Design a protein around this ligand. Structure first.
Ligand code: HEM
Length: 153
């Protein structure tokens, strides 16, 4: 469980993310794809992109980054009471998109990296720890749904 103080740290930095959802989303997906190239292969939509400059120029990639962060923000603002939001996401990512839990760990790392780069004054070690905890909770609950369906591992 996160404490109320930990949730406040998470949501305070998230409010800053919301000032520029598209720019954060772009940076997070590019970091994911550059650090873990296998992840790009799961996106028929994006797997033609080779270079960072190509990724930065793609409007479609920017659009999907907004989709990702909007969905995550809705989950974080539930402060753990996220069953209705999370279940549909787990179902699509397990059974349609075929995304291993490990790739959710990778995108979590990318989120932390980008938040540190763009919000240092609101993303000190205490806020980093809280955000890590929030993303662990997200992963744990997705993993339980994956296991039900036979996709944990
Ligand atoms: C913070 C974690 C993530 C969130 C909140 C998220 C959210 C979403 C949402 C809202 C959609 C559209 C609705 C749906 O299909 O469920 C989507 C689509 C998709 N996601 Fe994710 N996603 C996450 C992580 C990932 C990761 C790590 C991968 C791959 C490595 C991935 C691959 C896909 C694919 C392939 C689609 C379909 C894209 C298309 O062709 O339109 N997702 N995601």
């Amino acid at each position: 469980v996160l404490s109320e103080g930990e949730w406040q740290l998470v949501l305070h930095v998230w409010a800053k993310v919301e000032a520029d959802v598209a720019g954060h989303g772009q940076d997070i997906l590019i970091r994911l794809f550059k650090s873990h190239p296998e992840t790009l292969e799961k996106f028929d939509r994006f797997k033609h992109l080779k270079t960072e400059a190509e990724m930065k120029a793609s409007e479609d990639l920017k659009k999907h980054g907004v989709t990702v962060l909007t969905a995550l923000g809705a989950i974080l603002k539930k402060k753990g009471h996220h069953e209705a939001e999370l279940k549909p996401l787990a179902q699509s990512h397990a059974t349609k998109h075929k995304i291993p839990i490990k790739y959710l760990e990778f995108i979590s790392e990318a989120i932390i990296h980008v938040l540190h780069s763009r919000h240092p004054g609101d993303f000190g070690a205490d806020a980093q720890g809280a955000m890590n905890k929030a993303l662990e909770l997200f992963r744990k609950d997705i993993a339980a749904k994956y296991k039900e369906l036979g996709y944990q591992g």
